[PDB]
Design a protein around this nucleic acid. Structure first.
Ligand code: MG
Ligand code: MG
Ligand code: MG
Ligand code: MG
Ligand code: ZN
Lengths: 100, 55, 49, 69, 124, 122
RNA sequence: UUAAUUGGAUUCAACGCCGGGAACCUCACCGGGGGCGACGGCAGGAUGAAGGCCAGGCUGAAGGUCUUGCCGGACGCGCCGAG
Protein backbone atom coordinates (compact mmCIF):
# COMPACT_ATOMS: atom_id res chain seq x y z
CA UNK A 1 0.00 0.00 0.00
CA UNK A 2 3.11 2.17 -0.19
CA UNK A 3 4.99 3.55 -3.19
CA UNK A 4 8.77 3.99 -3.37
CA UNK A 5 10.31 6.73 -5.52
CA UNK A 6 13.94 6.83 -6.65
CA UNK A 7 15.56 9.98 -8.04
CA UNK A 8 18.95 10.45 -9.67
CA UNK A 9 20.55 13.43 -11.37
CA UNK A 10 23.90 15.05 -12.12
CA UNK A 11 22.57 18.48 -11.06
CA UNK A 12 21.81 18.89 -7.36
CA UNK A 13 19.40 21.83 -7.70
CA UNK A 14 16.94 20.07 -10.02
CA UNK A 15 16.85 17.09 -7.65
CA UNK A 16 16.00 19.44 -4.79
CA UNK A 17 13.24 21.06 -6.84
CA UNK A 18 11.60 17.72 -7.64
CA UNK A 19 11.89 16.56 -4.03
CA UNK A 20 10.35 19.80 -2.76
CA UNK A 21 7.46 19.50 -5.21
CA UNK A 22 6.75 15.95 -4.02
CA UNK A 23 6.97 17.08 -0.40
CA UNK A 24 4.50 19.92 -1.01
CA UNK A 25 2.11 17.56 -2.81
CA UNK A 26 2.22 15.24 0.20
CA UNK A 27 1.71 18.21 2.54
CA UNK A 28 -1.38 19.52 0.71
CA UNK A 29 -3.08 16.20 1.54
CA UNK A 30 -3.44 14.10 4.65
CA UNK A 31 -0.82 11.47 3.93
CA UNK A 32 2.36 10.43 5.73
CA UNK A 33 5.58 10.57 3.71
CA UNK A 34 8.99 9.33 4.80
CA UNK A 35 11.46 12.15 4.28
CA UNK A 36 13.87 12.28 1.34
CA UNK A 37 16.77 10.02 2.31
CA UNK A 38 20.14 10.93 0.73
CA UNK A 39 21.94 7.88 -0.65
CA UNK A 40 25.71 7.84 -1.31
CA UNK A 41 26.91 9.78 -4.34
CA UNK A 42 28.32 7.97 -7.37
CA UNK A 43 31.76 9.18 -8.46
CA UNK A 44 33.20 8.14 -11.83
CA UNK A 45 36.90 8.99 -12.03
CA UNK A 46 39.10 8.52 -15.11
CA UNK A 47 42.84 9.26 -15.25
CA UNK A 48 44.55 9.75 -18.60
CA UNK A 49 47.98 10.70 -19.91
CA UNK A 50 48.02 14.21 -21.38
CA UNK A 51 50.46 14.13 -24.29
CA UNK A 52 49.62 12.48 -27.62
CA UNK A 53 53.23 11.31 -28.06
CA UNK A 54 55.53 9.76 -25.45
CA UNK A 55 58.22 12.44 -25.20
CA UNK A 56 58.56 14.70 -22.18
CA UNK A 57 57.60 14.41 -18.54
CA UNK A 58 54.49 12.37 -17.81
CA UNK A 59 51.49 14.40 -16.63
CA UNK A 60 47.93 13.25 -16.00
CA UNK A 61 44.34 14.45 -16.14
CA UNK A 62 41.76 13.34 -13.55
CA UNK A 63 38.23 13.71 -14.93
CA UNK A 64 35.27 13.18 -12.62
CA UNK A 65 31.50 12.77 -12.99
CA UNK A 66 29.13 12.89 -10.01
CA UNK A 67 25.64 11.39 -9.73
CA UNK A 68 23.40 12.28 -6.78
CA UNK A 69 20.54 10.14 -5.50
CA UNK A 70 17.46 10.46 -3.29
CA UNK A 71 14.87 8.08 -1.86
CA UNK A 72 11.26 8.80 -0.87
CA UNK A 73 8.52 6.54 0.51
CA UNK A 74 4.83 7.47 0.47
CA UNK A 75 1.57 5.58 1.01
CA UNK A 76 -0.51 4.89 -2.10
CA UNK A 77 -3.47 7.28 -2.15
CA UNK A 78 -5.12 8.01 -5.48
CA UNK A 79 -5.85 11.65 -4.65
CA UNK A 80 -2.12 12.30 -4.22
CA UNK A 81 -0.93 9.56 -6.60
CA UNK A 82 -2.36 11.35 -9.64
CA UNK A 83 -0.76 14.65 -8.64
CA UNK A 84 2.76 13.22 -8.51
CA UNK A 85 2.07 11.26 -11.69
CA UNK A 86 1.45 14.53 -13.57
CA UNK A 87 4.53 16.44 -12.39
CA UNK A 88 7.07 17.13 -15.14
CA UNK A 89 10.73 16.47 -14.31
CA UNK A 90 13.61 18.24 -16.08
CA UNK A 91 15.44 16.34 -18.80
CA UNK A 92 18.48 15.74 -16.56
CA UNK A 93 16.57 13.97 -13.76
CA UNK A 94 15.59 10.29 -13.74
CA UNK A 95 12.55 9.15 -11.74
CA UNK A 96 11.31 5.62 -11.03
CA UNK A 97 8.13 4.63 -9.17
CA UNK A 98 7.29 1.20 -7.74
CA UNK A 99 4.63 -0.21 -5.42
CA UNK A 100 5.63 -2.31 -2.42
CA UNK B 1 33.29 -15.76 -55.31
CA UNK B 2 35.82 -12.92 -55.42
CA UNK B 3 34.28 -10.75 -52.68
CA UNK B 4 35.30 -13.33 -50.07
CA UNK B 5 38.92 -12.20 -50.52
CA UNK B 6 38.31 -8.85 -48.81
CA UNK B 7 36.13 -9.66 -45.79
CA UNK B 8 37.73 -9.87 -42.35
CA UNK B 9 37.23 -12.62 -39.79
CA UNK B 10 34.74 -11.92 -36.97
CA UNK B 11 37.04 -11.80 -33.94
CA UNK B 12 35.52 -11.62 -30.47
CA UNK B 13 38.63 -10.91 -28.37
CA UNK B 14 42.06 -9.36 -28.82
CA UNK B 15 43.24 -5.90 -29.77
CA UNK B 16 41.52 -6.25 -33.14
CA UNK B 17 38.03 -6.62 -31.68
CA UNK B 18 37.69 -3.00 -30.49
CA UNK B 19 37.95 0.31 -32.36
CA UNK B 20 37.38 3.90 -31.30
CA UNK B 21 33.87 4.98 -32.28
CA UNK B 22 35.20 8.43 -33.23
CA UNK B 23 38.47 7.81 -35.10
CA UNK B 24 38.74 4.03 -35.61
CA UNK B 25 42.14 3.56 -33.94
CA UNK B 26 43.24 0.26 -32.42
CA UNK B 27 45.04 0.13 -29.10
CA UNK B 28 44.53 2.46 -26.15
CA UNK B 29 40.75 2.15 -25.78
CA UNK B 30 39.02 3.21 -22.57
CA UNK B 31 36.55 0.44 -21.70
CA UNK B 32 35.23 1.87 -18.43
CA UNK B 33 31.44 1.75 -18.03
CA UNK B 34 30.85 0.97 -21.69
CA UNK B 35 32.79 3.85 -23.23
CA UNK B 36 34.61 2.98 -26.45
CA UNK B 37 37.00 5.88 -26.98
CA UNK B 38 40.71 6.37 -27.46
CA UNK B 39 42.68 8.13 -24.76
CA UNK B 40 43.30 10.84 -27.37
CA UNK B 41 39.64 11.39 -28.25
CA UNK B 42 38.42 11.27 -24.65
CA UNK B 43 40.46 14.31 -23.59
CA UNK B 44 38.86 16.63 -26.14
CA UNK B 45 35.23 15.50 -25.65
CA UNK B 46 35.20 14.99 -21.88
CA UNK B 47 33.69 18.44 -21.06
CA UNK B 48 30.85 17.80 -23.52
CA UNK B 49 30.05 14.56 -21.68
CA UNK B 50 29.80 16.34 -18.32
CA UNK B 51 33.18 15.47 -16.80
CA UNK B 52 35.17 18.12 -14.93
CA UNK B 53 38.62 18.48 -13.36
CA UNK B 54 37.81 19.20 -9.73
CA UNK B 55 41.26 18.31 -8.40
CA UNK C 1 29.99 -20.11 -79.07
CA UNK C 2 26.82 -22.21 -79.02
CA UNK C 3 26.16 -25.17 -76.72
CA UNK C 4 22.66 -26.53 -77.36
CA UNK C 5 22.66 -30.10 -78.69
CA UNK C 6 22.83 -33.79 -77.65
CA UNK C 7 19.06 -33.74 -77.00
CA UNK C 8 17.45 -36.10 -79.51
CA UNK C 9 15.02 -33.88 -81.44
CA UNK C 10 13.43 -34.96 -84.73
CA UNK C 11 10.89 -33.49 -87.15
CA UNK C 12 8.03 -33.08 -84.67
CA UNK C 13 9.33 -34.78 -81.49
CA UNK C 14 11.44 -33.14 -78.77
CA UNK C 15 12.99 -35.14 -75.93
CA UNK C 16 16.02 -34.37 -73.78
CA UNK C 17 19.00 -36.63 -73.12
CA UNK C 18 20.07 -34.99 -69.85
CA UNK C 19 17.36 -35.02 -67.19
CA UNK C 20 16.53 -32.09 -64.93
CA UNK C 21 17.19 -31.73 -61.23
CA UNK C 22 14.40 -33.42 -59.22
CA UNK C 23 14.74 -30.55 -56.74
CA UNK C 24 13.97 -28.16 -59.62
CA UNK C 25 11.87 -28.15 -62.77
CA UNK C 26 12.56 -29.14 -66.37
CA UNK C 27 14.88 -27.15 -68.59
CA UNK C 28 17.79 -27.42 -66.18
CA UNK C 29 20.27 -29.96 -67.53
CA UNK C 30 22.89 -32.13 -65.85
CA UNK C 31 26.42 -32.78 -67.11
CA UNK C 32 27.79 -35.88 -68.88
CA UNK C 33 30.19 -37.21 -66.25
CA UNK C 34 28.81 -40.73 -66.78
CA UNK C 35 29.97 -41.84 -63.35
CA UNK C 36 27.22 -39.83 -61.62
CA UNK C 37 24.69 -37.11 -62.37
CA UNK C 38 26.65 -33.89 -61.87
CA UNK C 39 23.33 -32.00 -62.05
CA UNK C 40 25.14 -28.73 -62.74
CA UNK C 41 23.93 -27.02 -59.57
CA UNK C 42 22.93 -29.53 -56.87
CA UNK C 43 24.67 -32.81 -57.69
CA UNK C 44 23.61 -36.40 -57.07
CA UNK C 45 25.67 -39.43 -56.02
CA UNK C 46 23.63 -42.13 -57.75
CA UNK C 47 26.22 -43.99 -59.91
CA UNK C 48 24.30 -43.58 -63.15
CA UNK C 49 24.38 -46.77 -65.19
CA UNK D 1 51.27 -41.62 -2.47
CA UNK D 2 51.99 -41.93 -6.19
CA UNK D 3 52.19 -38.13 -6.59
CA UNK D 4 55.13 -37.76 -4.18
CA UNK D 5 57.78 -39.69 -6.13
CA UNK D 6 60.38 -37.93 -8.27
CA UNK D 7 59.77 -39.98 -11.45
CA UNK D 8 56.12 -40.91 -11.94
CA UNK D 9 54.92 -42.68 -15.09
CA UNK D 10 58.32 -43.91 -16.25
CA UNK D 11 59.12 -43.52 -19.94
CA UNK D 12 60.10 -47.16 -20.45
CA UNK D 13 58.16 -49.37 -18.03
CA UNK D 14 55.28 -46.97 -17.36
CA UNK D 15 55.46 -47.40 -13.58
CA UNK D 16 55.99 -44.84 -10.82
CA UNK D 17 59.59 -44.88 -9.61
CA UNK D 18 61.88 -43.06 -7.19
CA UNK D 19 65.59 -42.80 -7.99
CA UNK D 20 68.62 -41.75 -5.97
CA UNK D 21 72.38 -41.27 -6.50
CA UNK D 22 73.87 -42.66 -9.73
CA UNK D 23 70.66 -44.12 -11.17
CA UNK D 24 69.02 -40.70 -10.97
CA UNK D 25 71.99 -39.06 -12.70
CA UNK D 26 72.05 -41.58 -15.54
CA UNK D 27 68.27 -41.34 -15.96
CA UNK D 28 68.52 -37.56 -16.39
CA UNK D 29 71.45 -37.99 -18.78
CA UNK D 30 69.43 -40.51 -20.79
CA UNK D 31 66.49 -38.11 -21.02
CA UNK D 32 68.73 -35.34 -22.35
CA UNK D 33 70.39 -37.75 -24.79
CA UNK D 34 67.00 -38.87 -26.09
CA UNK D 35 66.09 -35.23 -26.67
CA UNK D 36 69.37 -34.70 -28.53
CA UNK D 37 69.03 -37.78 -30.76
CA UNK D 38 65.80 -36.63 -32.43
CA UNK D 39 67.21 -33.10 -32.95
CA UNK D 40 64.45 -31.43 -30.95
CA UNK D 41 64.60 -27.76 -30.01
CA UNK D 42 65.35 -28.43 -26.34
CA UNK D 43 68.10 -30.83 -27.39
CA UNK D 44 69.84 -28.13 -29.42
CA UNK D 45 69.45 -25.69 -26.52
CA UNK D 46 71.03 -28.25 -24.18
CA UNK D 47 73.90 -28.78 -26.62
CA UNK D 48 74.69 -25.09 -27.02
CA UNK D 49 74.46 -24.33 -23.30
CA UNK D 50 71.65 -21.78 -23.73
CA UNK D 51 68.47 -21.24 -21.69
CA UNK D 52 65.80 -23.84 -22.41
CA UNK D 53 62.54 -22.58 -20.86
CA UNK D 54 62.00 -19.47 -22.96
CA UNK D 55 63.94 -16.77 -21.12
CA UNK D 56 65.17 -13.58 -22.76
CA UNK D 57 68.89 -13.54 -23.51
CA UNK D 58 69.66 -9.95 -24.54
CA UNK D 59 70.29 -8.52 -21.06
CA UNK D 60 70.90 -11.26 -18.48
CA UNK D 61 72.51 -14.72 -18.61
CA UNK D 62 75.85 -13.07 -19.38
CA UNK D 63 78.91 -15.18 -18.55
CA UNK D 64 82.10 -14.12 -20.31
CA UNK D 65 84.53 -11.23 -20.74
CA UNK D 66 84.02 -7.74 -22.11
CA UNK D 67 84.86 -7.22 -25.78
CA UNK D 68 86.57 -3.98 -26.77
CA UNK D 69 85.65 -1.73 -29.68
CA UNK E 1 66.94 -52.49 -27.43
CA UNK E 2 63.42 -52.44 -28.85
CA UNK E 3 61.23 -49.35 -28.54
CA UNK E 4 58.63 -49.07 -25.78
CA UNK E 5 56.66 -45.97 -24.82
CA UNK E 6 54.93 -46.96 -21.56
CA UNK E 7 55.68 -50.66 -21.67
CA UNK E 8 53.99 -51.05 -25.07
CA UNK E 9 55.56 -51.99 -28.38
CA UNK E 10 55.05 -49.97 -31.55
CA UNK E 11 52.60 -52.55 -32.91
CA UNK E 12 50.54 -52.32 -29.73
CA UNK E 13 50.43 -48.53 -30.11
CA UNK E 14 49.27 -48.97 -33.71
CA UNK E 15 46.16 -50.91 -32.64
CA UNK E 16 44.87 -48.31 -30.19
CA UNK E 17 41.89 -46.00 -30.35
CA UNK E 18 42.58 -42.28 -30.25
CA UNK E 19 40.97 -41.98 -26.81
CA UNK E 20 43.02 -44.91 -25.49
CA UNK E 21 46.28 -43.41 -26.77
CA UNK E 22 45.62 -40.05 -25.08
CA UNK E 23 45.85 -41.64 -21.63
CA UNK E 24 49.57 -42.27 -22.22
CA UNK E 25 50.58 -38.84 -23.54
CA UNK E 26 51.41 -35.93 -21.20
CA UNK E 27 48.75 -33.49 -20.00
CA UNK E 28 49.16 -30.94 -22.81
CA UNK E 29 48.80 -33.48 -25.61
CA UNK E 30 45.88 -35.15 -23.85
CA UNK E 31 44.04 -31.83 -23.59
CA UNK E 32 44.81 -30.96 -27.21
CA UNK E 33 43.47 -34.31 -28.44
CA UNK E 34 40.44 -34.11 -26.15
CA UNK E 35 39.37 -30.83 -27.78
CA UNK E 36 39.54 -32.30 -31.29
CA UNK E 37 41.56 -31.52 -34.38
CA UNK E 38 41.43 -28.36 -36.46
CA UNK E 39 40.26 -28.71 -40.08
CA UNK E 40 43.79 -28.25 -41.42
CA UNK E 41 45.00 -31.09 -39.21
CA UNK E 42 42.08 -33.15 -40.51
CA UNK E 43 43.24 -32.63 -44.10
CA UNK E 44 46.84 -33.44 -43.15
CA UNK E 45 45.76 -36.63 -41.38
CA UNK E 46 43.70 -37.65 -44.40
CA UNK E 47 46.75 -37.19 -46.63
CA UNK E 48 48.93 -39.19 -44.24
CA UNK E 49 46.47 -42.10 -44.09
CA UNK E 50 46.12 -42.03 -47.88
CA UNK E 51 49.91 -42.24 -48.20
CA UNK E 52 49.97 -45.15 -45.76
CA UNK E 53 47.34 -46.99 -47.83
CA UNK E 54 49.78 -47.05 -50.77
CA UNK E 55 48.53 -43.99 -52.68
CA UNK E 56 49.73 -40.39 -52.93
CA UNK E 57 53.35 -41.04 -53.92
CA UNK E 58 54.33 -37.38 -53.57
CA UNK E 59 56.17 -35.26 -50.99
CA UNK E 60 54.00 -34.21 -48.05
CA UNK E 61 54.41 -30.50 -47.25
CA UNK E 62 52.49 -28.63 -44.58
CA UNK E 63 52.07 -25.37 -42.69
CA UNK E 64 50.66 -27.13 -39.60
CA UNK E 65 53.53 -26.57 -37.19
CA UNK E 66 51.27 -27.44 -34.24
CA UNK E 67 50.35 -30.98 -35.31
CA UNK E 68 51.06 -33.68 -32.72
CA UNK E 69 53.13 -36.63 -33.92
CA UNK E 70 51.12 -39.86 -33.82
CA UNK E 71 52.31 -43.49 -33.89
CA UNK E 72 50.75 -44.11 -37.31
CA UNK E 73 52.96 -41.38 -38.80
CA UNK E 74 56.20 -43.26 -38.11
CA UNK E 75 58.27 -44.01 -41.21
CA UNK E 76 57.26 -41.07 -43.41
CA UNK E 77 59.03 -37.83 -44.31
CA UNK E 78 57.24 -34.50 -43.86
CA UNK E 79 58.26 -31.01 -44.98
CA UNK E 80 57.40 -28.44 -42.30
CA UNK E 81 57.35 -24.74 -43.16
CA UNK E 82 59.79 -22.71 -41.06
CA UNK E 83 58.84 -19.24 -42.26
CA UNK E 84 60.52 -19.25 -45.66
CA UNK E 85 61.10 -22.90 -46.68
CA UNK E 86 60.00 -26.48 -46.09
CA UNK E 87 62.61 -28.58 -44.28
CA UNK E 88 62.52 -32.40 -44.36
CA UNK E 89 61.82 -34.31 -41.15
CA UNK E 90 62.24 -38.08 -40.88
CA UNK E 91 59.82 -39.35 -38.25
CA UNK E 92 61.42 -41.70 -35.71
CA UNK E 93 59.55 -43.72 -33.06
CA UNK E 94 60.94 -41.56 -30.24
CA UNK E 95 59.16 -38.51 -31.72
CA UNK E 96 55.73 -39.62 -30.46
CA UNK E 97 53.99 -36.85 -28.54
CA UNK E 98 55.91 -33.83 -29.88
CA UNK E 99 54.78 -30.99 -32.11
CA UNK E 100 56.11 -30.88 -35.66
CA UNK E 101 57.43 -27.34 -35.25
CA UNK E 102 59.94 -28.58 -32.68
CA UNK E 103 61.98 -30.05 -35.56
CA UNK E 104 61.99 -27.02 -37.91
CA UNK E 105 63.99 -24.17 -36.36
CA UNK E 106 62.93 -20.67 -37.37
CA UNK E 107 66.05 -18.67 -36.40
CA UNK E 108 69.63 -18.99 -37.61
CA UNK E 109 72.44 -19.59 -35.13
CA UNK E 110 74.31 -16.44 -34.12
CA UNK E 111 78.02 -15.84 -34.77
CA UNK E 112 79.05 -12.46 -33.39
CA UNK E 113 81.29 -10.01 -35.20
CA UNK E 114 83.32 -7.07 -33.98
CA UNK E 115 81.38 -4.59 -31.81
CA UNK E 116 80.56 -1.42 -33.71
CA UNK E 117 80.68 2.28 -32.94
CA UNK E 118 78.49 3.10 -29.95
CA UNK E 119 78.78 -0.34 -28.35
CA UNK E 120 80.62 1.15 -25.35
CA UNK E 121 80.59 4.48 -23.54
CA UNK E 122 83.97 5.53 -24.97
CA UNK E 123 83.14 4.51 -28.56
CA UNK E 124 80.29 7.00 -29.07
CA UNK F 1 13.47 -18.98 -87.60
CA UNK F 2 15.48 -18.68 -90.82
CA UNK F 3 14.57 -17.45 -94.33
CA UNK F 4 15.89 -20.73 -95.75
CA UNK F 5 12.88 -22.53 -94.25
CA UNK F 6 9.66 -22.18 -96.25
CA UNK F 7 6.85 -22.26 -93.68
CA UNK F 8 4.48 -19.86 -95.47
CA UNK F 9 4.51 -16.45 -97.15
CA UNK F 10 5.10 -13.05 -95.51
CA UNK F 11 1.68 -11.56 -94.68
CA UNK F 12 1.78 -7.83 -94.03
CA UNK F 13 -0.70 -7.98 -91.14
CA UNK F 14 1.54 -10.44 -89.30
CA UNK F 15 4.38 -7.91 -89.34
CA UNK F 16 1.99 -5.07 -88.47
CA UNK F 17 0.70 -6.87 -85.37
CA UNK F 18 4.05 -8.42 -84.38
CA UNK F 19 6.28 -5.32 -84.64
CA UNK F 20 4.02 -2.27 -84.19
CA UNK F 21 2.31 -3.75 -81.10
CA UNK F 22 5.33 -4.27 -78.83
CA UNK F 23 6.62 -0.71 -78.52
CA UNK F 24 3.28 0.25 -76.95
CA UNK F 25 3.71 -2.92 -74.86
CA UNK F 26 7.42 -2.51 -74.07
CA UNK F 27 6.83 0.24 -71.49
CA UNK F 28 3.96 -1.72 -69.89
CA UNK F 29 5.43 -5.20 -69.96
CA UNK F 30 8.48 -7.40 -69.53
CA UNK F 31 10.97 -8.52 -72.18
CA UNK F 32 13.10 -11.69 -72.30
CA UNK F 33 15.43 -12.06 -75.29
CA UNK F 34 17.75 -14.94 -76.18
CA UNK F 35 16.89 -18.30 -77.70
CA UNK F 36 18.27 -20.29 -74.75
CA UNK F 37 16.42 -18.19 -72.17
CA UNK F 38 13.15 -18.25 -74.13
CA UNK F 39 13.48 -22.01 -74.69
CA UNK F 40 12.90 -22.65 -70.99
CA UNK F 41 10.15 -20.01 -71.03
CA UNK F 42 8.31 -21.62 -73.96
CA UNK F 43 8.85 -25.13 -72.57
CA UNK F 44 7.36 -24.05 -69.23
CA UNK F 45 4.85 -21.70 -70.87
CA UNK F 46 6.35 -18.58 -69.29
CA UNK F 47 6.35 -16.61 -72.54
CA UNK F 48 3.16 -14.98 -73.83
CA UNK F 49 4.14 -13.53 -77.23
CA UNK F 50 6.80 -15.53 -79.08
CA UNK F 51 7.97 -13.38 -82.00
CA UNK F 52 10.48 -15.59 -83.82
CA UNK F 53 12.58 -13.61 -86.29
CA UNK F 54 14.25 -15.32 -89.24
CA UNK F 55 17.89 -14.51 -88.56
CA UNK F 56 19.38 -17.54 -86.76
CA UNK F 57 21.59 -19.90 -88.75
CA UNK F 58 21.96 -22.79 -89.00
CA UNK F 59 18.76 -24.71 -88.22
CA UNK F 60 20.34 -26.04 -85.02
CA UNK F 61 19.08 -23.80 -82.19
CA UNK F 62 16.04 -22.81 -84.28
CA UNK F 63 14.83 -26.42 -84.64
CA UNK F 64 13.26 -26.41 -81.18
CA UNK F 65 10.34 -23.95 -81.29
CA UNK F 66 8.48 -25.27 -84.38
CA UNK F 67 8.74 -28.86 -83.09
CA UNK F 68 7.42 -27.65 -79.71
CA UNK F 69 4.67 -25.38 -81.08
CA UNK F 70 2.09 -28.18 -81.14
CA UNK F 71 2.82 -29.01 -77.48
CA UNK F 72 1.57 -25.74 -75.95
CA UNK F 73 -0.64 -22.83 -76.96
CA UNK F 74 2.53 -20.77 -77.68
CA UNK F 75 0.98 -17.71 -79.38
CA UNK F 76 3.75 -16.98 -81.87
CA UNK F 77 4.34 -14.64 -84.81
CA UNK F 78 7.27 -14.08 -87.17
CA UNK F 79 9.46 -11.01 -87.63
CA UNK F 80 11.09 -9.97 -90.93
CA UNK F 81 14.09 -8.07 -89.51
CA UNK F 82 16.29 -8.27 -86.42
CA UNK F 83 18.17 -4.95 -86.29
CA UNK F 84 15.16 -2.92 -85.15
CA UNK F 85 13.55 -5.86 -83.32
CA UNK F 86 15.56 -4.97 -80.23
CA UNK F 87 14.76 -1.30 -80.79
CA UNK F 88 11.02 -2.05 -80.68
CA UNK F 89 11.45 -3.68 -77.26
CA UNK F 90 14.85 -4.15 -75.66
CA UNK F 91 18.30 -2.75 -76.42
CA UNK F 92 20.26 -1.64 -79.48
CA UNK F 93 21.39 -5.10 -80.61
CA UNK F 94 20.25 -7.84 -82.99
CA UNK F 95 17.44 -9.77 -81.28
CA UNK F 96 15.93 -13.12 -82.25
CA UNK F 97 12.95 -13.53 -79.90
CA UNK F 98 11.55 -10.81 -77.62
CA UNK F 99 9.04 -12.52 -75.33
CA UNK F 100 6.57 -10.14 -73.66
CA UNK F 101 4.50 -11.64 -70.85
CA UNK F 102 1.27 -9.90 -69.75
CA UNK F 103 1.58 -6.62 -71.71
CA UNK F 104 -0.64 -3.63 -71.05
CA UNK F 105 -3.38 -2.65 -73.51
CA UNK F 106 -2.02 -4.88 -76.29
CA UNK F 107 -4.76 -7.52 -76.32
CA UNK F 108 -7.17 -6.97 -79.22
CA UNK F 109 -4.67 -6.79 -82.09
CA UNK F 110 -2.53 -9.59 -80.66
CA UNK F 111 -5.58 -11.82 -80.23
CA UNK F 112 -6.77 -11.06 -83.77
CA UNK F 113 -3.38 -11.86 -85.30
CA UNK F 114 -3.15 -15.01 -83.17
CA UNK F 115 -6.53 -16.15 -84.51
CA UNK F 116 -5.34 -15.30 -88.02
CA UNK F 117 -2.27 -17.49 -87.54
CA UNK F 118 -4.43 -20.27 -86.06
CA UNK F 119 -6.71 -20.24 -89.11
CA UNK F 120 -3.73 -19.72 -91.46
CA UNK F 121 -1.33 -22.58 -90.69
CA UNK F 122 -0.41 -24.58 -87.58
C1' U G 1 73.41 -11.35 -35.95
C1' U G 2 69.39 -12.32 -39.43
C1' A G 3 64.89 -13.51 -44.81
C1' A G 4 63.06 -9.88 -41.29
C1' U G 5 64.83 -9.14 -36.30
C1' U G 6 59.26 -2.52 -38.36
C1' G G 7 59.59 2.51 -36.63
C1' G G 8 60.00 7.40 -33.11
C1' A G 9 62.83 9.47 -28.71
C1' U G 10 69.74 10.45 -26.84
C1' U G 11 71.98 15.81 -20.83
C1' C G 12 68.61 17.90 -17.19
C1' A G 13 63.70 17.69 -20.68
C1' A G 14 65.69 9.56 -24.50
C1' C G 15 65.96 4.39 -22.02
C1' G G 16 58.54 -0.11 -17.10
C1' C G 17 58.38 6.35 -22.58
C1' C G 18 54.85 6.31 -27.25
C1' G G 19 49.23 4.36 -21.77
C1' G G 20 54.29 -0.36 -26.16
C1' G G 21 52.11 -6.57 -20.08
C1' A G 22 52.90 -7.92 -29.33
C1' A G 23 51.07 -16.36 -29.34
C1' C G 24 46.50 -15.01 -34.02
C1' C G 25 44.54 -9.74 -34.77
C1' U G 26 47.38 -5.12 -33.19
C1' C G 27 51.50 -4.59 -37.72
C1' A G 28 53.78 -0.70 -39.91
C1' C G 29 58.80 -5.97 -41.10
C1' C G 30 60.08 -11.01 -43.92
C1' G G 31 58.42 -15.75 -47.38
C1' G G 32 54.20 -17.04 -50.23
C1' G G 33 48.91 -16.79 -52.35
C1' G G 34 44.56 -14.07 -53.93
C1' G G 35 41.17 -9.35 -54.72
C1' C G 36 40.04 -4.02 -56.10
C1' G G 37 39.60 1.24 -61.21
C1' A G 38 32.91 5.75 -59.23
C1' C G 39 32.44 8.63 -64.00
C1' G G 40 33.73 9.56 -69.08
C1' G G 41 34.84 7.39 -73.32
C1' C G 42 37.51 2.97 -77.07
C1' A G 43 37.37 -3.02 -78.95
C1' G G 44 33.27 -6.00 -77.73
C1' G G 45 28.11 -7.76 -76.30
C1' A G 46 21.00 -11.42 -76.37
C1' U G 47 23.77 -15.30 -82.22
C1' G G 48 24.92 -13.22 -75.07
C1' A G 49 28.34 -9.46 -72.15
C1' A G 50 30.20 -8.68 -66.81
C1' G G 51 29.73 -12.57 -63.28
C1' G G 52 28.78 -18.07 -60.25
C1' C G 53 29.12 -23.41 -59.45
C1' C G 54 28.84 -30.40 -58.53
C1' A G 55 33.33 -33.55 -58.93
C1' G G 56 38.90 -34.20 -59.93
C1' G G 57 44.34 -32.07 -60.81
C1' C G 58 47.98 -27.68 -59.45
C1' U G 59 48.34 -26.00 -54.20
C1' G G 60 50.11 -25.08 -47.31
C1' A G 61 44.61 -24.90 -48.51
C1' A G 62 41.80 -22.95 -52.20
C1' G G 63 35.95 -22.68 -59.01
C1' G G 64 42.23 -18.66 -57.46
C1' U G 65 43.32 -21.38 -61.94
C1' C G 66 42.83 -25.82 -65.10
C1' U G 67 40.00 -30.37 -66.69
C1' U G 68 34.95 -31.78 -67.20
C1' G G 69 29.81 -28.53 -68.78
C1' C G 70 26.18 -26.39 -66.23
C1' C G 71 24.58 -21.80 -64.80
C1' G G 72 22.29 -15.94 -65.44
C1' G G 73 20.98 -11.85 -68.36
C1' A G 74 23.43 -5.67 -69.73
C1' C G 75 27.11 -4.02 -69.50
C1' G G 76 32.02 -3.75 -70.75
C1' C G 77 40.56 -2.38 -67.24
C1' G G 78 41.76 -6.15 -73.27
C1' C G 79 42.87 0.27 -74.09
C1' C G 80 43.15 5.59 -72.75
C1' G G 81 41.85 9.56 -68.94
C1' A G 82 40.16 9.93 -64.17
C1' G G 83 39.29 8.08 -59.22
MG1 MG H 1 64.25 -0.16 -31.84
MG1 MG I 1 53.17 -1.25 -19.98
MG1 MG J 1 52.76 -10.80 -24.42
MG1 MG K 1 51.56 -10.80 -34.76
ZN1 ZN L 1 39.79 7.98 -30.80
Amino acid sequence: QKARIKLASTNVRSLEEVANQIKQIAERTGVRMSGPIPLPTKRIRIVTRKSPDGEGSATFDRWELRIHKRLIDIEADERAMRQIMRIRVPEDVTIEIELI
Amino acid sequence: AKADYNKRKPRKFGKGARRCIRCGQYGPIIRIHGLMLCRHCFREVAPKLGFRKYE
Amino acid sequence: GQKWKLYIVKDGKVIRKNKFCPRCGPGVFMADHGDRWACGRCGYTEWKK
Amino acid sequence: PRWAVNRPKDYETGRDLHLITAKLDMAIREDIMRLRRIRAYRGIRHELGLPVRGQRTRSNFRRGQTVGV
Amino acid sequence: KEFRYRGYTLEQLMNMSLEELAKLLPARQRRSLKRGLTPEQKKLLRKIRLAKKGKYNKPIRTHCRDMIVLPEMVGLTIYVHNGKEFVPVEIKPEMIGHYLGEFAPTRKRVQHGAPGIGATRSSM
Amino acid sequence: AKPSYVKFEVPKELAEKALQAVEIARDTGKIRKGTNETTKAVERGQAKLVIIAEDVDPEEIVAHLPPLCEEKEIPYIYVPSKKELGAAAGIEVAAASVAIIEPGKARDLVEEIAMKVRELMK
